[PDB]
mmCIF file of C-alpha atoms (C1' of nucleotides) and ligand atoms in Angstrom:
data_model
loop_
_atom_site.group_PDB
_atom_site.id
_atom_site.type_symbol
_atom_site.label_atom_id
_atom_site.label_comp_id
_atom_site.label_asym_id
_atom_site.label_seq_id
_atom_site.Cartn_x
_atom_site.Cartn_y
_atom_site.Cartn_z
ATOM 1 C CA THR A 1 -2.342 5.903 -18.252
ATOM 2 C CA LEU A 2 1.290 4.737 -18.356
ATOM 3 C CA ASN A 3 -0.080 1.211 -17.843
ATOM 4 C CA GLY A 4 -3.681 2.025 -18.716
ATOM 5 C CA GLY A 5 -4.145 -1.107 -20.787
ATOM 6 C CA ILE A 6 -3.223 -3.332 -17.854
ATOM 7 C CA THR A 7 -5.199 -1.314 -15.299
ATOM 8 C CA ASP A 8 -8.320 -1.356 -17.487
ATOM 9 C CA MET A 9 -7.987 -5.135 -17.874
ATOM 10 C CA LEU A 10 -7.694 -5.631 -14.137
ATOM 11 C CA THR A 11 -10.617 -3.304 -13.476
ATOM 12 C CA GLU A 12 -12.805 -5.243 -15.918
ATOM 13 C CA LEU A 13 -11.805 -8.443 -14.116
ATOM 14 C CA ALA A 14 -12.629 -6.837 -10.768
ATOM 15 C CA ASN A 15 -16.083 -5.820 -11.940
ATOM 16 C CA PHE A 16 -16.691 -9.311 -13.291
ATOM 17 C CA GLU A 17 -15.866 -10.962 -9.977
ATOM 18 C CA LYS A 18 -17.985 -8.469 -8.052
ATOM 19 C CA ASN A 19 -21.010 -8.355 -10.337
ATOM 20 C CA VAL A 20 -21.153 -11.847 -11.851
ATOM 21 C CA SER A 21 -19.169 -14.147 -9.564
ATOM 22 C CA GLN A 22 -20.224 -12.248 -6.456
ATOM 23 C CA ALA A 23 -16.673 -12.839 -5.238
ATOM 24 C CA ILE A 24 -15.970 -9.654 -3.276
ATOM 25 C CA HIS A 25 -12.474 -10.655 -2.157
ATOM 26 C CA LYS A 26 -11.401 -11.425 -5.724
ATOM 27 C CA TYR A 27 -12.923 -8.088 -6.697
ATOM 28 C CA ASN A 28 -10.745 -6.309 -4.147
ATOM 29 C CA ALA A 29 -7.677 -8.352 -5.086
ATOM 30 C CA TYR A 30 -8.018 -7.084 -8.661
ATOM 31 C CA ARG A 31 -8.722 -3.480 -7.573
ATOM 32 C CA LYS A 32 -5.610 -3.441 -5.398
ATOM 33 C CA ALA A 33 -3.420 -4.801 -8.195
ATOM 34 C CA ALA A 34 -4.870 -2.201 -10.551
ATOM 35 C CA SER A 35 -4.238 0.479 -7.942
ATOM 36 C CA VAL A 36 -0.616 -0.496 -7.260
ATOM 37 C CA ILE A 37 0.103 -0.639 -10.989
ATOM 38 C CA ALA A 38 -1.601 2.664 -11.791
ATOM 39 C CA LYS A 39 0.790 4.143 -9.234
ATOM 40 C CA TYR A 40 3.874 2.488 -10.794
ATOM 41 C CA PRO A 41 6.053 5.204 -12.454
ATOM 42 C CA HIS A 42 7.295 2.869 -15.203
ATOM 43 C CA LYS A 43 5.701 1.359 -18.297
ATOM 44 C CA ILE A 44 5.482 -2.317 -17.330
ATOM 45 C CA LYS A 45 7.538 -4.580 -19.620
ATOM 46 C CA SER A 46 6.558 -7.954 -18.180
ATOM 47 C CA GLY A 47 4.433 -9.852 -15.701
ATOM 48 C CA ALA A 48 7.567 -10.663 -13.717
ATOM 49 C CA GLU A 49 8.275 -6.948 -13.297
ATOM 50 C CA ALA A 50 4.681 -6.477 -12.124
ATOM 51 C CA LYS A 51 4.795 -9.380 -9.676
ATOM 52 C CA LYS A 52 7.416 -7.441 -7.729
ATOM 53 C CA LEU A 53 4.625 -5.107 -6.636
ATOM 54 C CA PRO A 54 2.508 -6.016 -3.573
ATOM 55 C CA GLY A 55 -0.921 -7.193 -4.654
ATOM 56 C CA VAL A 56 0.301 -8.591 -7.952
ATOM 57 C CA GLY A 57 0.671 -12.347 -7.609
ATOM 58 C CA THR A 58 1.308 -15.250 -9.986
ATOM 59 C CA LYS A 59 -2.174 -15.287 -11.537
ATOM 60 C CA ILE A 60 -2.130 -11.591 -12.384
ATOM 61 C CA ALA A 61 1.487 -11.783 -13.526
ATOM 62 C CA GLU A 62 0.420 -14.423 -16.051
ATOM 63 C CA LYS A 63 -2.476 -12.301 -17.265
ATOM 64 C CA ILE A 64 -0.210 -9.292 -17.708
ATOM 65 C CA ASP A 65 2.138 -11.434 -19.802
ATOM 66 C CA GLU A 66 -0.768 -12.509 -22.022
ATOM 67 C CA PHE A 67 -2.025 -8.937 -22.309
ATOM 68 C CA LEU A 68 1.400 -7.528 -23.161
ATOM 69 C CA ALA A 69 1.984 -10.190 -25.786
ATOM 70 C CA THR A 70 -1.397 -10.009 -27.546
ATOM 71 C CA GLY A 71 -3.001 -6.748 -26.466
ATOM 72 C CA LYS A 72 -5.961 -8.581 -24.980
ATOM 73 C CA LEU A 73 -7.079 -11.316 -22.598
ATOM 74 C CA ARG A 74 -8.929 -14.443 -23.750
ATOM 75 C CA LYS A 75 -10.632 -14.813 -20.357
ATOM 76 C CA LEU A 76 -12.237 -11.378 -20.718
ATOM 77 C CA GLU A 77 -12.958 -11.922 -24.423
ATOM 78 C CA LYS A 78 -15.093 -14.917 -23.446
ATOM 79 C CA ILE A 79 -16.792 -13.025 -20.622
ATOM 80 C CA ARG A 80 -17.815 -10.235 -23.004
ATOM 81 C CA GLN A 81 -19.406 -12.765 -25.356
ATOM 82 C CA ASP A 82 -21.378 -14.328 -22.529
ATOM 83 C CA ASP A 83 -24.894 -12.880 -22.713
ATOM 84 C CA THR A 84 -25.730 -13.584 -19.079
ATOM 85 C CA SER A 85 -22.493 -12.117 -17.727
ATOM 86 C CA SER A 86 -22.886 -9.079 -19.968
ATOM 87 C CA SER A 87 -26.504 -8.528 -18.948
ATOM 88 C CA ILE A 88 -25.715 -8.800 -15.242
ATOM 89 C CA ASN A 89 -22.770 -6.436 -15.619
ATOM 90 C CA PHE A 90 -24.949 -3.918 -17.425
ATOM 91 C CA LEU A 91 -27.827 -3.838 -14.936
ATOM 92 C CA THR A 92 -25.462 -3.287 -11.993
ATOM 93 C CA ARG A 93 -24.649 0.040 -13.634
ATOM 94 C CA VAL A 94 -28.043 1.307 -12.454
ATOM 95 C CA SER A 95 -27.694 2.822 -8.970
ATOM 96 C CA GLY A 96 -29.662 0.632 -6.588
ATOM 97 C CA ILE A 97 -29.215 -2.563 -8.616
ATOM 98 C CA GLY A 98 -26.437 -4.731 -7.244
ATOM 99 C CA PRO A 99 -25.077 -8.214 -8.127
ATOM 100 C CA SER A 100 -28.038 -9.989 -6.528
ATOM 101 C CA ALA A 101 -30.792 -7.813 -8.019
ATOM 102 C CA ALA A 102 -29.087 -7.907 -11.413
ATOM 103 C CA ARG A 103 -28.962 -11.710 -11.512
ATOM 104 C CA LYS A 104 -32.580 -11.914 -10.342
ATOM 105 C CA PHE A 105 -33.836 -9.482 -12.992
ATOM 106 C CA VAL A 106 -31.936 -11.458 -15.618
ATOM 107 C CA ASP A 107 -33.712 -14.629 -14.455
ATOM 108 C CA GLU A 108 -37.036 -12.846 -14.883
ATOM 109 C CA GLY A 109 -36.016 -11.943 -18.420
ATOM 110 C CA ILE A 110 -35.332 -8.280 -17.643
ATOM 111 C CA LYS A 111 -31.961 -7.668 -19.279
ATOM 112 C CA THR A 112 -31.968 -4.280 -20.984
ATOM 113 C CA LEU A 113 -32.629 -0.604 -20.417
ATOM 114 C CA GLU A 114 -35.842 -1.040 -22.421
ATOM 115 C CA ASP A 115 -36.859 -3.920 -20.139
ATOM 116 C CA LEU A 116 -36.160 -1.951 -16.974
ATOM 117 C CA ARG A 117 -38.278 0.943 -18.219
ATOM 118 C CA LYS A 118 -41.302 -1.227 -19.013
ATOM 119 C CA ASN A 119 -40.934 -2.901 -15.612
ATOM 120 C CA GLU A 120 -40.429 0.071 -13.288
ATOM 121 C CA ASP A 121 -43.130 -1.603 -11.193
ATOM 122 C CA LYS A 122 -40.606 -4.189 -10.004
ATOM 123 C CA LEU A 123 -38.025 -1.623 -8.846
ATOM 124 C CA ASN A 124 -37.625 -0.164 -5.364
ATOM 125 C CA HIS A 125 -37.389 3.619 -4.925
ATOM 126 C CA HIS A 126 -33.606 3.872 -5.224
ATOM 127 C CA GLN A 127 -33.520 1.675 -8.334
ATOM 128 C CA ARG A 128 -36.281 3.736 -9.937
ATOM 129 C CA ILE A 129 -34.291 6.977 -9.578
ATOM 130 C CA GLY A 130 -31.136 5.238 -10.777
ATOM 131 C CA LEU A 131 -32.962 4.216 -13.935
ATOM 132 C CA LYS A 132 -34.445 7.694 -14.382
ATOM 133 C CA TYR A 133 -30.990 9.291 -14.430
ATOM 134 C CA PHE A 134 -29.070 6.338 -15.851
ATOM 135 C CA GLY A 135 -27.439 8.427 -18.546
ATOM 136 C CA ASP A 136 -26.748 11.501 -16.452
ATOM 137 C CA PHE A 137 -25.119 9.455 -13.682
ATOM 138 C CA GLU A 138 -22.638 8.129 -16.250
ATOM 139 C CA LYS A 139 -21.364 11.639 -16.938
ATOM 140 C CA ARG A 140 -18.392 13.193 -15.123
ATOM 141 C CA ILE A 141 -18.570 16.578 -13.386
ATOM 142 C CA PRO A 142 -16.054 19.222 -14.487
ATOM 143 C CA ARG A 143 -14.351 20.842 -11.492
ATOM 144 C CA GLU A 144 -15.787 24.154 -12.714
ATOM 145 C CA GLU A 145 -19.283 22.817 -12.144
ATOM 146 C CA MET A 146 -18.241 21.353 -8.775
ATOM 147 C CA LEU A 147 -17.220 24.871 -7.697
ATOM 148 C CA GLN A 148 -20.675 26.208 -8.624
ATOM 149 C CA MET A 149 -22.273 23.320 -6.759
ATOM 150 C CA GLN A 150 -20.078 23.993 -3.713
ATOM 151 C CA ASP A 151 -21.008 27.677 -3.842
ATOM 152 C CA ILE A 152 -24.707 26.821 -3.798
ATOM 153 C CA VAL A 153 -24.442 24.206 -1.041
ATOM 154 C CA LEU A 154 -22.374 26.309 1.364
ATOM 155 C CA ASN A 155 -24.467 29.439 0.891
ATOM 156 C CA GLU A 156 -27.763 27.577 1.303
ATOM 157 C CA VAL A 157 -26.503 25.813 4.407
ATOM 158 C CA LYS A 158 -25.345 29.184 5.763
ATOM 159 C CA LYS A 159 -28.871 30.566 5.267
ATOM 160 C CA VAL A 160 -30.297 27.739 7.386
ATOM 161 C CA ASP A 161 -27.876 28.164 10.281
ATOM 162 C CA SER A 162 -24.662 30.184 10.219
ATOM 163 C CA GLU A 163 -23.139 27.581 12.563
ATOM 164 C CA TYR A 164 -23.227 24.772 9.986
ATOM 165 C CA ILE A 165 -19.954 23.901 8.286
ATOM 166 C CA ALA A 166 -20.211 22.062 4.971
ATOM 167 C CA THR A 167 -17.056 20.626 3.426
ATOM 168 C CA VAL A 168 -16.857 19.089 -0.053
ATOM 169 C CA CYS A 169 -14.809 15.922 0.086
ATOM 170 C CA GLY A 170 -14.377 13.002 -2.313
ATOM 171 C CA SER A 171 -12.118 13.500 -5.343
ATOM 172 C CA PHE A 172 -12.928 17.221 -5.253
ATOM 173 C CA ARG A 173 -10.968 17.667 -2.016
ATOM 174 C CA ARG A 174 -8.256 15.482 -3.524
ATOM 175 C CA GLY A 175 -7.975 18.157 -6.224
ATOM 176 C CA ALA A 176 -9.375 16.164 -9.153
ATOM 177 C CA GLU A 177 -10.150 18.142 -12.327
ATOM 178 C CA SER A 178 -13.443 16.247 -12.562
ATOM 179 C CA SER A 179 -15.581 14.161 -10.195
ATOM 180 C CA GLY A 180 -18.223 11.449 -10.501
ATOM 181 C CA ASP A 181 -20.484 13.043 -7.865
ATOM 182 C CA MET A 182 -20.508 15.492 -4.945
ATOM 183 C CA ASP A 183 -19.725 14.419 -1.381
ATOM 184 C CA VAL A 184 -20.574 16.856 1.393
ATOM 185 C CA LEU A 185 -19.435 16.480 4.996
ATOM 186 C CA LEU A 186 -21.649 18.424 7.384
ATOM 187 C CA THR A 187 -21.220 19.454 11.017
ATOM 188 C CA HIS A 188 -23.176 21.585 13.488
ATOM 189 C CA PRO A 189 -22.189 22.456 17.078
ATOM 190 C CA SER A 190 -25.458 21.080 18.478
ATOM 191 C CA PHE A 191 -24.490 17.575 17.343
ATOM 192 C CA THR A 192 -21.476 15.940 19.016
ATOM 193 C CA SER A 193 -20.588 12.432 20.211
ATOM 194 C CA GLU A 194 -21.757 13.705 23.591
ATOM 195 C CA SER A 195 -25.280 14.759 22.645
ATOM 196 C CA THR A 196 -27.771 15.759 19.953
ATOM 197 C CA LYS A 197 -29.147 19.088 21.164
ATOM 198 C CA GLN A 198 -31.190 19.799 18.028
ATOM 199 C CA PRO A 199 -33.329 17.452 15.901
ATOM 200 C CA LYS A 200 -33.666 17.420 12.113
ATOM 201 C CA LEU A 201 -30.223 18.978 11.685
ATOM 202 C CA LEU A 202 -29.717 17.134 8.377
ATOM 203 C CA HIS A 203 -33.396 17.392 7.422
ATOM 204 C CA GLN A 204 -33.350 21.218 7.581
ATOM 205 C CA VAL A 205 -30.469 21.369 5.133
ATOM 206 C CA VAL A 206 -31.990 18.819 2.753
ATOM 207 C CA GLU A 207 -35.280 20.745 2.930
ATOM 208 C CA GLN A 208 -33.588 24.057 2.100
ATOM 209 C CA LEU A 209 -31.738 22.546 -0.887
ATOM 210 C CA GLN A 210 -34.957 21.082 -2.284
ATOM 211 C CA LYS A 211 -36.651 24.446 -1.675
ATOM 212 C CA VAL A 212 -34.225 26.179 -4.041
ATOM 213 C CA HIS A 213 -34.567 23.288 -6.498
ATOM 214 C CA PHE A 214 -30.976 22.112 -6.088
ATOM 215 C CA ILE A 215 -31.839 18.681 -4.676
ATOM 216 C CA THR A 216 -34.316 17.067 -7.075
ATOM 217 C CA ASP A 217 -34.561 13.471 -5.892
ATOM 218 C CA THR A 218 -33.869 11.342 -2.825
ATOM 219 C CA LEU A 219 -32.350 7.853 -2.977
ATOM 220 C CA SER A 220 -32.319 7.315 0.786
ATOM 221 C CA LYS A 221 -32.409 9.554 3.845
ATOM 222 C CA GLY A 222 -31.648 9.045 7.515
ATOM 223 C CA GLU A 223 -30.729 11.225 10.492
ATOM 224 C CA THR A 224 -27.062 11.329 9.507
ATOM 225 C CA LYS A 225 -26.848 10.330 5.844
ATOM 226 C CA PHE A 226 -28.567 11.702 2.769
ATOM 227 C CA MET A 227 -28.106 10.148 -0.668
ATOM 228 C CA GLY A 228 -29.796 11.845 -3.571
ATOM 229 C CA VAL A 229 -29.761 13.862 -6.757
ATOM 230 C CA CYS A 230 -29.065 17.528 -7.491
ATOM 231 C CA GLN A 231 -28.836 19.855 -10.488
ATOM 232 C CA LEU A 232 -27.230 23.217 -11.165
ATOM 233 C CA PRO A 233 -29.665 25.844 -12.440
ATOM 234 C CA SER A 234 -29.303 26.805 -16.090
ATOM 235 C CA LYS A 235 -29.771 30.182 -17.778
ATOM 236 C CA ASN A 236 -32.525 31.318 -20.136
ATOM 237 C CA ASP A 237 -32.654 29.335 -23.392
ATOM 238 C CA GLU A 238 -29.710 27.164 -22.378
ATOM 239 C CA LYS A 239 -29.764 23.368 -22.192
ATOM 240 C CA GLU A 240 -30.009 22.328 -18.582
ATOM 241 C CA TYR A 241 -27.182 20.597 -16.762
ATOM 242 C CA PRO A 242 -27.152 16.832 -16.188
ATOM 243 C CA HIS A 243 -28.561 15.630 -12.870
ATOM 244 C CA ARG A 244 -25.864 14.644 -10.374
ATOM 245 C CA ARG A 245 -25.459 12.250 -7.476
ATOM 246 C CA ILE A 246 -25.044 13.953 -4.120
ATOM 247 C CA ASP A 247 -24.307 12.494 -0.701
ATOM 248 C CA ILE A 248 -24.447 14.481 2.528
ATOM 249 C CA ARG A 249 -23.062 13.040 5.754
ATOM 250 C CA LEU A 250 -23.771 14.679 9.121
ATOM 251 C CA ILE A 251 -20.940 13.880 11.526
ATOM 252 C CA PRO A 252 -20.414 14.759 15.199
ATOM 253 C CA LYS A 253 -18.604 18.102 15.289
ATOM 254 C CA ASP A 254 -15.956 16.730 17.663
ATOM 255 C CA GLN A 255 -15.206 13.872 15.236
ATOM 256 C CA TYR A 256 -14.629 16.060 12.179
ATOM 257 C CA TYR A 257 -11.092 14.871 11.407
ATOM 258 C CA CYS A 258 -11.945 11.171 11.327
ATOM 259 C CA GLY A 259 -14.970 12.129 9.253
ATOM 260 C CA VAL A 260 -13.161 14.262 6.672
ATOM 261 C CA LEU A 261 -10.413 11.623 6.426
ATOM 262 C CA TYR A 262 -13.074 9.037 5.639
ATOM 263 C CA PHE A 263 -15.060 11.183 3.184
ATOM 264 C CA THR A 264 -11.948 12.379 1.338
ATOM 265 C CA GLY A 265 -10.848 8.816 0.579
ATOM 266 C CA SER A 266 -10.155 7.388 -1.840
ATOM 267 C CA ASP A 267 -12.048 4.207 -1.052
ATOM 268 C CA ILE A 268 -8.980 2.099 -1.715
ATOM 269 C CA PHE A 269 -6.869 4.567 0.270
ATOM 270 C CA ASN A 270 -9.275 4.112 3.178
ATOM 271 C CA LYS A 271 -9.088 0.325 2.901
ATOM 272 C CA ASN A 272 -5.292 0.372 2.847
ATOM 273 C CA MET A 273 -5.089 2.815 5.745
ATOM 274 C CA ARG A 274 -7.606 0.936 7.889
ATOM 275 C CA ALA A 275 -5.813 -2.348 7.235
ATOM 276 C CA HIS A 276 -2.465 -0.796 8.163
ATOM 277 C CA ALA A 277 -4.115 0.567 11.298
ATOM 278 C CA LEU A 278 -5.110 -2.931 12.400
ATOM 279 C CA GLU A 279 -1.556 -4.204 11.900
ATOM 280 C CA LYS A 280 -0.394 -1.340 14.112
ATOM 281 C CA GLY A 281 -2.956 -2.196 16.776
ATOM 282 C CA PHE A 282 -5.634 0.387 16.027
ATOM 283 C CA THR A 283 -9.025 0.440 14.314
ATOM 284 C CA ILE A 284 -10.308 3.375 12.273
ATOM 285 C CA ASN A 285 -13.821 4.369 11.225
ATOM 286 C CA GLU A 286 -15.353 7.709 10.184
ATOM 287 C CA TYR A 287 -15.790 8.614 13.848
ATOM 288 C CA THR A 288 -12.637 7.668 15.733
ATOM 289 C CA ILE A 289 -9.372 5.762 15.907
ATOM 290 C CA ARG A 290 -9.291 3.351 18.822
ATOM 291 C CA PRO A 291 -6.506 1.101 20.112
ATOM 292 C CA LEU A 292 -6.981 -2.676 20.123
ATOM 293 C CA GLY A 293 -6.716 -4.396 23.492
ATOM 294 C CA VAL A 294 -4.722 -7.517 24.330
ATOM 295 C CA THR A 295 -7.741 -9.514 23.149
ATOM 296 C CA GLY A 296 -8.390 -7.433 20.056
ATOM 297 C CA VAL A 297 -11.406 -5.477 21.285
ATOM 298 C CA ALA A 298 -11.575 -1.771 20.451
ATOM 299 C CA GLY A 299 -10.782 0.524 23.353
ATOM 300 C CA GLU A 300 -11.808 4.126 24.002
ATOM 301 C CA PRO A 301 -11.459 6.788 21.258
ATOM 302 C CA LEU A 302 -7.999 8.362 21.092
ATOM 303 C CA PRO A 303 -7.578 12.165 21.069
ATOM 304 C CA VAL A 304 -7.527 13.662 17.549
ATOM 305 C CA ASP A 305 -6.934 17.302 16.608
ATOM 306 C CA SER A 306 -6.053 17.020 12.927
ATOM 307 C CA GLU A 307 -5.929 14.470 10.130
ATOM 308 C CA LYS A 308 -2.201 14.234 10.765
ATOM 309 C CA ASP A 309 -2.782 12.893 14.270
ATOM 310 C CA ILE A 310 -4.537 9.903 12.747
ATOM 311 C CA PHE A 311 -1.557 9.260 10.464
ATOM 312 C CA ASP A 312 0.838 9.676 13.421
ATOM 313 C CA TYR A 313 -0.950 7.010 15.483
ATOM 314 C CA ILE A 314 -0.360 4.371 12.824
ATOM 315 C CA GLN A 315 3.172 5.586 12.093
ATOM 316 C CA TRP A 316 2.454 6.867 8.588
ATOM 317 C CA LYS A 317 3.955 10.082 7.273
ATOM 318 C CA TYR A 318 1.175 12.549 6.501
ATOM 319 C CA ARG A 319 -0.280 12.497 3.010
ATOM 320 C CA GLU A 320 -2.072 15.484 1.532
ATOM 321 C CA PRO A 321 -5.542 14.747 0.110
ATOM 322 C CA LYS A 322 -4.132 14.986 -3.430
ATOM 323 C CA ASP A 323 -1.828 12.048 -2.755
ATOM 324 C CA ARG A 324 -4.615 9.762 -1.489
ATOM 325 C CA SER A 325 -6.101 8.901 -4.901
ATOM 326 C CA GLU A 326 -5.413 5.165 -4.808
ATOM 327 C "C1'" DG B 1 -6.497 -13.480 -5.877
ATOM 328 C "C1'" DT B 2 -2.748 -12.279 -2.824
ATOM 329 C "C1'" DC B 3 -0.459 -12.083 1.375
ATOM 330 C "C1'" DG B 4 2.191 -13.008 6.115
ATOM 331 C "C1'" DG B 5 2.671 -15.761 9.884
ATOM 332 C "C1'" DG C 1 -44.057 -3.207 16.089
ATOM 333 C "C1'" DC C 2 -38.864 -5.211 17.360
ATOM 334 C "C1'" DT C 3 -34.384 -7.353 16.165
ATOM 335 C "C1'" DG C 4 -31.176 -9.315 13.066
ATOM 336 C "C1'" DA C 5 -29.457 -10.608 8.453
ATOM 337 C "C1'" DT C 6 -28.733 -9.028 3.804
ATOM 338 C "C1'" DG C 7 -28.231 -5.933 -0.179
ATOM 339 C "C1'" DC C 8 -26.307 -1.839 -1.641
ATOM 340 C "C1'" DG C 9 -23.396 1.998 -1.853
ATOM 341 C "C1'" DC C 10 -20.282 4.225 0.275
ATOM 342 C "C1'" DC D 1 -0.374 -23.994 3.949
ATOM 343 C "C1'" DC D 2 -4.672 -21.130 5.854
ATOM 344 C "C1'" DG D 3 -6.936 -17.495 7.767
ATOM 345 C "C1'" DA D 4 -7.580 -12.677 6.749
ATOM 346 C "C1'" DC D 5 -9.322 -9.403 3.569
ATOM 347 C "C1'" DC D 6 -12.335 -1.732 6.431
ATOM 348 C "C1'" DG D 7 -16.114 -0.323 8.485
ATOM 349 C "C1'" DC D 8 -20.885 1.383 8.464
ATOM 350 C "C1'" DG D 9 -25.893 4.103 7.243
ATOM 351 C "C1'" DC D 10 -30.178 3.178 5.163
ATOM 352 C "C1'" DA D 11 -33.720 0.081 2.865
ATOM 353 C "C1'" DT D 12 -35.730 -4.115 2.873
ATOM 354 C "C1'" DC D 13 -37.039 -8.405 4.403
ATOM 355 C "C1'" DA D 14 -37.832 -12.737 7.500
ATOM 356 C "C1'" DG D 15 -39.127 -14.250 11.829
ATOM 357 C "C1'" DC D 16 -41.226 -13.395 16.004
HETATM 358 C C1 GFM E 401 -14.884 7.794 -6.756
HETATM 359 C C2 GFM E 401 -14.635 9.287 -6.450
HETATM 360 F F1 GFM E 401 -13.385 9.608 -6.876
HETATM 361 P P1 GFM E 401 -15.875 10.256 -7.465
HETATM 362 O O1 GFM E 401 -17.120 10.206 -6.649
HETATM 363 O O2 GFM E 401 -15.379 11.648 -7.495
HETATM 364 O O3 GFM E 401 -15.884 9.735 -8.854
HETATM 365 P P2 GFM E 401 -14.950 9.502 -4.604
HETATM 366 O O4 GFM E 401 -15.671 10.778 -4.388
HETATM 367 O O5 GFM E 401 -13.580 9.332 -4.053
HETATM 368 O O6 GFM E 401 -15.772 8.324 -4.132
HETATM 369 P P3 GFM E 401 -17.227 8.201 -3.725
HETATM 370 O O7 GFM E 401 -17.942 9.437 -4.116
HETATM 371 O O8 GFM E 401 -17.732 6.887 -4.217
HETATM 372 O O9 GFM E 401 -17.279 8.141 -2.131
HETATM 373 C C3 GFM E 401 -16.827 9.246 -1.340
HETATM 374 C C4 GFM E 401 -15.827 8.795 -0.302
HETATM 375 O O10 GFM E 401 -16.388 7.789 0.571
HETATM 376 C C5 GFM E 401 -15.328 6.972 1.068
HETATM 377 N N1 GFM E 401 -15.613 5.588 0.703
HETATM 378 C C6 GFM E 401 -16.221 5.139 -0.444
HETATM 379 N N2 GFM E 401 -16.266 3.837 -0.524
HETATM 380 C C7 GFM E 401 -15.661 3.405 0.645
HETATM 381 C C8 GFM E 401 -15.396 2.096 1.103
HETATM 382 O O11 GFM E 401 -15.630 1.019 0.533
HETATM 383 N N3 GFM E 401 -14.781 2.108 2.351
HETATM 384 C C9 GFM E 401 -14.447 3.243 3.060
HETATM 385 N N4 GFM E 401 -13.859 3.056 4.264
HETATM 386 N N5 GFM E 401 -14.672 4.471 2.629
HETATM 387 C C10 GFM E 401 -15.278 4.478 1.425
HETATM 388 C C11 GFM E 401 -14.039 7.476 0.417
HETATM 389 C C12 GFM E 401 -14.564 8.141 -0.839
HETATM 390 O O12 GFM E 401 -13.650 9.127 -1.340
HETATM 391 CL CL1 CL E 402 -14.071 -13.868 -3.012
HETATM 392 CL CL1 CL E 403 -11.730 13.462 14.902
HETATM 393 CL CL1 CL E 404 -16.748 4.858 17.072
HETATM 394 MG MG1 MG E 405 -17.528 11.228 -4.866
HETATM 395 NA NA1 NA E 406 3.711 -9.252 -5.883
HETATM 396 NA NA1 NA E 407 -25.632 -0.675 -9.178
HETATM 397 NA NA1 NA E 408 -20.494 9.783 -3.227
#
DNA sequence: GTCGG
DNA sequence: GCTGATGCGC
DNA sequence: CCGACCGCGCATCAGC
C-alpha cells in the first residue's frame, strides 16, 4: 500500500481496457505496471521516478504525475461517469459474464443486478451460478477458513483413495492471510503422462465432496478440471458461511512440479516466468518445460524433479511461493 | 501500453 | 455427430 | 520503428 493510490489507479485502467475496450494487451500492460510498482520499496515521488521501472512507460509516467499532483485521474473520472462503461464493468463482475457477454447484455437493456435476476433465462449455466452467489464471491476467505476447507478436502479425498494427493495452491500456498477462492491440485498414481489406468479419477472426488455437502454447485467439469462452489458446514444456530469458489485440477502424477508451479502462481508471476523462459529458449506450461528448437518448435519434455529445476533451466534463482505474489 | 531488436 | 474458432477463467 | 505480448481446459457455437 506504499503506492496503493497509484496501483489502484492502474488496476482500474487495466479493468477498463479489458472489460470495455476489449484491449487485452493494454490490460496486461497496466497490470504489469501496477505489479512492478506495488513491488517498489519506495513511496513514488514522481512519474519520472516510476518510468525507471520496467513496464512503466511515458503514458503511465504522465498519469502518475497527474495522480500525484491532484489525487485523481480525469480519464478515469470520465469513465466512471459513463453509464455504458460502468454497466459493462459491473456485469463482468459476475462469474461467467465476460467483456463480450457484458456488452451484449447492455445492448439488450440488461444493465443491473435486478435486470440479471429477472432475466436468468438468458444466462448459461455458469453465469446463472455466478449471479446466484454474486455477493458471496465478492468476499475474501480468511486463512483460518482456508485451513478448515483444506482439512475437509484432504480427508475426503483420502476416504476415496488413500493414494490421492491433494495440494492447496493459489495464494494459500503463497502464504496469504486471506484468499479469494480455493485452488486444489490433485494427483493419483493411476494417471500419468504415460497412461490413464483408472477412469473418473476426478469425478470420484467431486462426487464424494458433493456427498458430504461441501461442493454445492458446478460451474464446469471435465476429466481434468473442475470449477465450482463449496461451503464450510456451520454449527447449530450459527449463520452459515458464505459460498466459495473452488477449482480442482487433476494433473499427471509425473508432472506434479510443473503443475504446482502453475497452480501456485501468481498469474502475473506465471506470465513473467513463461516469458523469461521463451527468451532463454524454453517454453513452460502446467505440464512440462521444453526447449525450443532452431526453428522455435517445442522439443521433448525436460527432466524435472522439483520446482527448483524449472527455475534452474531458465537461469533464475529459486523463489519460494511466498515471493511469487506479483 | 511498453519493450528490445 | 466432428472439427475449429471464440469466450471465459484460469 | 514494429512485432511480440503465457499457455490451456471447458462451454458454446458455426459450419459441415
Ligand atoms: C488471485 C489469487 F491470489 P486468489 O484466488 O487467492 O484471490 P490466486 O489463487 O493466485 O489466483 P486464481 O485463484 O485466480 O488462480 C489460481 C492460479 O492459477 C494460475 N493462473 C491464473 N491465471 C493464470 C493466467 O492467466 N496464466 C497462467 N499461466 N496461470 C494462471 C496461477 C494462479 O495462482
Ligand atoms: Cl490491446
Ligand atoms: Cl514436473
Ligand atoms: Cl506438454
Ligand atoms: Mg485462488
Ligand atoms: Na520504464
Ligand atoms: Na466475469
Ligand atoms: Na481459482
